[PDB]
């Protein structure tokens with residue numbers, strides 16, 4: 076009966092902080108670019124009015140470019156902790172600052188989780204306070220960022236804004252807006268979570284590794 080959220084996106088966009096805003100506590104550690112990067116998954120637990128909310132905060136290593144060996148066993152761990160599948164993938168971007176590294180992070184989500192995990196993805200904009208009480212929809216309508224338009228469209232126009240430093244009632248207000256989207260998206264899905272061939276495999280570490288390499292390979296075969 077729980078709700079499963081997986082935080083994804085470029086490093087330093089504010090997803091760990093986003094997890095904290097949603098759960099309304101000190102769950103994951105926010106951190107500057109100066110700090111040491113995470114190689115391991117972290118999970119946390121909360122609730123939003125009779126529904127238990129479960130968040131999985133993926134490591135920064137997921138976004139890394141070249142060969143990292145510790146990647147495969149941590150993708151298995153991320154899959155095992157989100158089993159049997161996430162209801163929502165939460166792609167976190169900084170408002171007004173969507174770059175190549177962001178497009179690249181959005182690619183890795185597709186590569187790892189599946190090309191249609193985007194149909195269970197909501198785009199979360201951080202630094203909401205830069206709108207100055209302005210509409211997030213109106214800012215998106217008048218955006219010249221062509222690559223962000225692609226990502227939002229692939230996510231079915233589902234967008235949201237967060238000020239991760241907001242406290243008290245202002246925090247509830249913005250989290251409700253997200254909880255509205257989740258609710259609306261889940262209605263489109265009839266309460267279903269996202270699953271793939273890899274979640275089915277999880278009902279050892281070697282067989283998953285081999286199955287994950289093959290899966291990721293296929294997801295790149297579409298992108299041609």
Ligand SMILES: Nc1nc2c(ncn2[C@@H]2O[C@H](COP(=O)(O)OP(=O)(O)O)[C@@H](O)[C@H]2O)c(=O)[nH]1
Pocket residue numbers: 085086087088089090091092093104105106107167201202203237238239240
């Ligand atoms: N002003 C502002 N800063 C934010 C917001 N969200 C995150 N940050 C800051 O961005 C930095 C990186 O945050 P972090 O959660 O570690 O980003 P992550 O790498 O995506 O997990 C921290 O110093 C946060 O305080 C926001 O909505 N507004």
Ligand SMILES: [Mg+2]
Pocket residue numbers: 090091104105106113
């Ligand atoms: Mg982080």
